[PDB]
Amino acid sequence: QVQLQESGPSLVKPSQTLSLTCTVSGFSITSDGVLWVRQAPGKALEWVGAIYQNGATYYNPALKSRLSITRDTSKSQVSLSLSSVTTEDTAVYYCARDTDYDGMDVWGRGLLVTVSQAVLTQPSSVSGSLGQSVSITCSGSSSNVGYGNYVSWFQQVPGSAPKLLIYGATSRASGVPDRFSGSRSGNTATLTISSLQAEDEADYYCASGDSGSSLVFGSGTRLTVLG
Amino acid sequence: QVQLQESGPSLVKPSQTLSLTCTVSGFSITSDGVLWVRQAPGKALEWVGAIYQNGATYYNPALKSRLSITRDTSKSQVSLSLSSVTTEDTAVYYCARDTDYDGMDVWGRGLLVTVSSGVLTQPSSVSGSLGQSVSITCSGSSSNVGYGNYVSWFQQVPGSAPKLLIYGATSRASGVPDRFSGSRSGNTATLTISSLQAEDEADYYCASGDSGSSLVFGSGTRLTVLG
């Protein structure tokens, strides 16, 4: 069974290095990529960096001056170091797998760590009755959502690892009910839920590759369902 | 590090047996007990059962007819079988440690299991302003709260495993700030939070040892911090 688990200090002093480890089981670090994502309290998901099958690394430009990601293939381990931390780096840090054909499908449950340019627009809130169709659009640019078929959607019940819904703009992730659909009209991508159910009440995030070989998340959408 | 993890299938058809394994590391199942707790979506915590160091087993009288708990000390595993399942058994299933002197201090992250095919009294809600005191009482009887200093208090941020605050009515769990204190007077236990911070917003559960060698949880209390 495919498992990822983040570990390390839950407390870090300002100006110290935040060091986390990802332990992987049920797959080889040399077959699938490993991603780091983080989420500050009451904030959107933010891509941190990635390490691929050849150990090739990619960082978030805003964190690059302070990031090191490394791998130990023999122990199935990926390491994050973030230096010069302030309280702005307090967040839940997520581990996730990035596959050839299945997208960013498996996530660790996240570790809360306390320290003591282009963007994707989403409406803050959407709502709907049981059985109703609902649509959520994320807007980007020619560089990200328009740049080709590289768009993901995620569902997050807050206090939980996000869950892949849609990858490559239109493909439904394995085990995802087929009331979820993705479409894409040039610079805009749209997730449709044809028949809203009670456990669809969650936050939804658009994510897109940029030209700059980075990944960008949207601002997030709170979906309410009206009993 | 002390770590517990619940594994097993997340979907189970009515009338079949729900089988879960808890895998333990950083301590021996011959030194510390392991208990199972479950939570129905938007419901209180419910004691399932416990297996101690000698392998002595205890069950929730309400679930006893359908429950088996076993252990394998060599693989460091504790098994849970619950037979004759209905939708009423749909819940997050939590594995937790029970220690001689630290109380029920470490918890697994919990596993949701959906069964599908298609008395301890707490005030329900309480509020305080930043910087101010807040008191939560749980009412019981002479067999549970009234009996010994066997009273615990938990914090649960929804989406998250309960966290131990107080054990033995009065003693603070390791790493718990001292703005949390416990008192006990007759059939009544009180948790006091003395300097409310915004992260103290959460659900709070009283739990008590019980004269029928059982463990019972209270109805829970939603705390709000006024800005």
PDB file of C-alpha atoms in Angstrom, chain A residues 1 3 5 109-111 158-160, chain B residues 3 5-6 109-111 158-160:
ATOM      1  CA  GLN A   1       0.000   0.000   0.000  1.00  0.00           C
ATOM      2  CA  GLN A   3       2.182   5.569   2.122  1.00  0.00           C
ATOM      3  CA  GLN A   5       4.809  10.210   6.193  1.00  0.00           C
ATOM      4  CA  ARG A 109      -1.345  13.496   6.494  1.00  0.00           C
ATOM      5  CA  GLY A 110       0.829  16.634   7.165  1.00  0.00           C
ATOM      6  CA  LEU A 111       3.098  17.891  10.027  1.00  0.00           C
ATOM      7  CA  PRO A 158      -9.852  21.453   6.485  1.00  0.00           C
ATOM      8  CA  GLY A 159      -7.607  19.594   8.988  1.00  0.00           C
ATOM      9  CA  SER A 160      -6.779  16.978   6.257  1.00  0.00           C
TER      10      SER A 160
ATOM     11  CA  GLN B   3       3.962   6.375  16.919  1.00  0.00           C
ATOM     12  CA  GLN B   5      -0.976   3.980  12.810  1.00  0.00           C
ATOM     13  CA  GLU B   6      -4.440   2.434  12.028  1.00  0.00           C
ATOM     14  CA  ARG B 109      -4.050  10.021  13.061  1.00  0.00           C
ATOM     15  CA  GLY B 110      -7.266   7.942  12.613  1.00  0.00           C
ATOM     16  CA  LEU B 111      -8.765   5.997   9.637  1.00  0.00           C
ATOM     17  CA  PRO B 158     -11.850  18.846  13.942  1.00  0.00           C
ATOM     18  CA  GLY B 159      -9.851  16.881  11.287  1.00  0.00           C
ATOM     19  CA  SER B 160      -7.274  15.927  14.009  1.00  0.00           C
TER      20      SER B 160
END
